[PDB]
Design a protein around this ligand. Structure first.
Ligand SMILES: Nc1ncnc2c1ncn2[C@@H]1O[C@H](COP(=O)(O)OP(=O)(O)OP(O)(O)=S)[C@@H](O)[C@H]1O
Ligand SMILES: Nc1ncnc2c1ncn2[C@@H]1O[C@H](COP(=O)(O)OP(=O)(O)OP(O)(O)=S)[C@@H](O)[C@H]1O
Ligand SMILES: [Mg+2]
Ligand SMILES: [Mg+2]
Lengths: 157, 158, 44, 255, 256, 254
């Protein structure tokens, strides 16, 4: 049949097992423990543990509400202007009850491939719906994201 | 007959692929064991990457080869959106099949862009269980390292 | 918004139709709505 | 935690079709006395507030009050599945996440259960008070709907004349003018077709034709519509019901 | 050479109603026992197999096998001009190059013939790998079509679950969820609306909205539709006919 | 100056839509006996002629000939606003700069007025190129519309042969071929359907598929169509709707 690769078999399911960038990992652990997740753009070279880190952060923040509290937008699914205008807006407008301190999660992995217009429409729906949902970006190059998005996020290098 | 010899003398099985030995022995170990990960053939043109993989796919896929493989080309007149749609439709379908492990024959990946390669590796992530990918390229420096880390890298020498 | 809070004196007194880029700014989708908002009174 | 069973399937379909075309977001506020829903159009001109008593359901528990905020389009698409020969059951829970609609029938084998995810809406609650509006008349809904439909094609604005116990609708345009004048009367053969009127002061107001059409779209719930307007207060169009009422708050223009 | 005679002209229309959208090009294999046809879609997801018997023939002679390919769009374009009174008649010659269909009435001399060219694909295959199924169930086609169309607005995936002595349809989407459950009942007054079921193994496979909607649109072909469900195998959708049946192989969806 | 009230606006809509796809700009010279419209296509292959009698108008009081040049697309847009129970009245003054298309309803509460400017096209003369035709035939227009649409798919050129008193249409295509033959048949139970034929000289004419597709558009006017074919003169495709006349001329492609 098939054997599970050690890259996925031994993938850390918690933020503590992730090594490297001790300050940022500890701060993410503190955010997950307390709550009030900030908007951040995780940037850096590929294969250093950004997608795993953000997934573990979402796991530790939500728990059982992972399926209905996270909307993941990757390059495989379409991420055009209509996507941002309709499904991200509907997910932000969705009424999901969470314990205090937690918020809905919107993860856009490989955000460097986003079109300019989709990013331009993204800043307003993230500024207006910041009280219910929080966005998380993970891109290889931080220069491919326009300045307004960086002005509304704490860029993680 | 009156045809170019390039397609006339293709190796119908893995035994007629000469020159390359380590990769063929690894393929034989894989088929004997049964593990078929994601593969990546690259190197100078004419080393026989396409011939080796078509021999592999035919000797595994018997008669329903003509249905359950699909040979792709990144340089054709389709575009990134069309190739993405084709890959999703061929991977997320699970048609009338005797045995699974769908195979992707994607040639000439050196012309693929960064966003297209990221989409390809994301589709590889999502549909690993049912579909196996064997994207083919020629130069290893024209491919993003994220795509290299998700395929069994096999260099081809003259 | 701070000017509205100053002049109105209450948060609910003023009403702002804040137009963003997250919806469609097309003529056939918002023309009548904006004319209705700018023509008639607001229920309160 | 919610269990409201309508005696017929068509009632809720009609009452949600009454105000579907004007508003897109509706805020149900189910409590112990009954189900109450308020909605405001995207132009914040007309306010749709709906009240239904406990007598309109076969059973209704609602032990604790709860607010339900959902979209008109998805709800309508869900109800369009249900056959008219069914008994809708509205099921919800404390800290609402999704609303459950059960489509029961005499043939228990053919039964369907549906779910709809609620929408996070920040309701701007308003204090609706019975003010002393100057005019008060009640007229059959069909005649009002026909008059509004006829006068819509002539002008975008519809003007009313309420003076000396006379009902007149005014629509003036460049191509022509359209005026319909009918007088109050009481008919013993059919009291539902009678015209009633009670004034305190004369009123002259003008409202848009499209919003009037959206109001008359809901004329399928009652045979008669109560209109209460003031010289300075938002127009109130009340569609009476068997166990509740559906009222519309139309706002006047400027000067 | 080939004489295919239809007493009722609407039969061909209500047969090709399912073909007109599913597969772009199909070939008809005409044999002495009737006409058969098998087609595969562009994405190789749905396989459509058609069987016509001698019972639906006033007169028929097909002594030699015929390889007859055509376009379904042009077939329907010629077909919609047929009246409810005229009868049908398919005529072909040796090594056919253009199919001709004849319209003839009984009380008036109205002759309507039309020439249609043949499409060559050089692709013809017939296969029946496996036949037995874990579950047997049938239901009215109109009810099934209504259920599918009403459940299609919620999600693109429909899970046809068969629990013990019941049928369950599950569709979970972004705007909400939907669960339609129907139990097998026999209406002795009106047996057409009766639902019959026998169960051997549990059934928990899913499908797609668009292809199965393509399946349900052919409800005009038969008021009763036969449903075949089995684990680790594509479903079979059978529409009953007096001389044969039209069957579909719709692939499942990988779920884990 | 001009005041003609149509019996029904649907008749005007249908007669305008009959040749709407063929030509774009036409001239309407209206006289005592009626209104006549003639124009030529851009490719100089098609000739269009109109003639509407005065008995189809409820009231008609034109007292002097006048030419009315006006486009067809805006005319179609104007007539699309008409209703089933609305009559159309054409109004022109002594110095026509705009034409009023007034719509009148049974109830006097609905009045619709539409105005459009005049266009100045250099009007030609009645060809009178018509000469005796070798073959004349009549058949319901729906069957010829279906036959032309079916035959245009096979090839861009359609040949008409009336040899040995048999009406046959031939269109040899690159990837296919077709041949439909219709014999003269007369039906007594349904006078509406009939196949008449008169043969004087053999006919062999080939026309364009697009041209015939444009011709067959006006099938909503008359139940049956008369066809006149000549070896040298252009073919005469006349629609007889019993209120007015519509004839189409097509130059054979050589
Ligand atoms: N510091 C780390 N500790 C443990 N595992 C790690 C660490 N960094 C990376 N990994 C693993 O290495 C693999 C890399 O996966 P990803 O986190 O998706 O890579 P990435 O850093 O997001 O960059 P990409 O995916 O190429 S854009 C995963 O299996 C991770 O679990
Ligand atoms: N080791 C080999 N043994 C036998 N024939 C070979 C071998 N390598 C290449 N060939 C033949 O050489 C030709 C090259 O065909 P391909 O394998 O398609 O070329 P390629 O190596 O895939 O490189 P490209 O330019 O990317 S198609 C074919 O006719 C092969 O049969
Ligand atoms: Mg990543
Ligand atoms: Mg190659």
């Amino acid at each position: 049949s098939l054997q599970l690769p050690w890259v996925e078999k031994y993938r850390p399911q918690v933020l503590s097992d992730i090594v490297g960038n001790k300050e940022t990992i500890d701060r993410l652990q503190q955010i997950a423990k307390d709550g009030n997740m900030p908007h951040m753009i995780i940037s850096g070279m590929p294969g250093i543990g950004k997608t795993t880190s953000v997934h573990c952060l979402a796991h530790e923040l939500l728990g059982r509400s992972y399926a209905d509290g996270v909307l993941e937008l990757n390059a495989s699914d379409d991420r055009g202007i209509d996507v941002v205008r309709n499904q991200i807006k509907h997910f932000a407008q969705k009424k999901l009850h969470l314990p205090p301190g937690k918020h809905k999660i919107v993860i856009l992995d490989e955000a460097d491939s986003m079109t300019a217009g989709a990013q331009q429409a993204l800043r307003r729906t993230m500024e207006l719906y910041s009280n219910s949902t929080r966005f998380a970006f993970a891109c290889n190059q931080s220069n491919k994201i326009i300045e307004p998005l960086q002005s509304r996020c704490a860029i993680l290098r | 007959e009156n045809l170019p010899w390039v397609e006339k003398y293709r190796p119908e099985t893995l035994d007629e692929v000469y020159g390359q030995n380590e990769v063929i022995t690894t393929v034989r170990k894989f088929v004997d064991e049964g593990k078929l990960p994601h593969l990546l053939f690259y190197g100078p043109p004419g080393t026989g990457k396409t011939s080796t993989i078509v021999a592999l796919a035919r000797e595994i896929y018997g008669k329903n080869y003509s249905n359950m493989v699909l040979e792709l080309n990144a340089s054709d007149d389709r575009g990134i959106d069309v190739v993405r749609n084709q890959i999703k439709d061929f991977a997320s379908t699970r048609q009338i099949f005797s045995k699974g492990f769908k195979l992707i024959i994607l040639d000439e990946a050196d012309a693929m862009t960064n966003a297209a390669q990221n989409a390809l590796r994301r589709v590889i992530e999502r549909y690993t269980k049912n579909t196996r990918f064997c994207v083919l390229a020629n130069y290893a420096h024209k491919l993003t390292p994220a795509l290299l880390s998700r395929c069994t890298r096999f260099r081809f020498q003259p | 918004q701070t000017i509205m809070r100053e002049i109105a004196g209450d948060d609910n007194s003023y009403q702002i139709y804040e137009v963003n880029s997250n919806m469609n700014r097309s003529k056939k989708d918002l023309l009548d709505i904006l004319l209705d908002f700018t023509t008639t009174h607001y229920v309160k | 935690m919610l269990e409201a069973k309508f005696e017929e399937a068509s009632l809720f379909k009609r009452i949600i079709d009454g105000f579907k075309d004007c508003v897109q977001l509706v805020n149900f506020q189910c409590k112990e006395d009954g189900i109450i829903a308020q909605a405001v159009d995207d132009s914040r001109v007309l306010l749709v507030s709906l009240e239904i008593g406990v007598e309109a359901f076969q059973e209704y528990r609602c032990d604790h009050p709860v607010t339900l905020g959902m979209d008109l389009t998805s709800l309508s698409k869900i109800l369009r599945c249900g056959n008219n020969t069914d008994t809708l059951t509205l099921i919800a829970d404390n800290t609402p996440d999704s609303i459950i609609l059960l489509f029961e029938d005499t043939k228990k084998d053919r039964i369907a259960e549906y779910s709809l995810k609620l929408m996070d809406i920040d309701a701007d609650f308003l204090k609706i008070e019975e003010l002393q509006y100057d005019s008060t008349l009640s007229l059959p809904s069909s005649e009002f709907s026909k008059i509004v439909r006829d006068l819509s094609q002539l002008s975008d604005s519809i003007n009313i004349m309420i003076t000396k116990e006379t009902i007149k609708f005014v629509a003036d345009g460049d191509i022509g003018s359209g005026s319909v004048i009918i007088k109050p009367f009481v008919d013993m053969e059919h009291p539902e077709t009678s015209i009633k009127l009670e004034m305190d002061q004369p009123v002259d107001l003008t409202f848009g034709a499209k919003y009037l059409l959206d109001i008359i779209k809901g004329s399928s719930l009652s045979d008669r519509v109560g209109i209460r307007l003031s010289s300075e207060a938002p127009a109130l169009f009340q569609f009476d019901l068997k166990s509740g009422f559906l009222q519309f708050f139309l706002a006047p223009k400027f000067n």
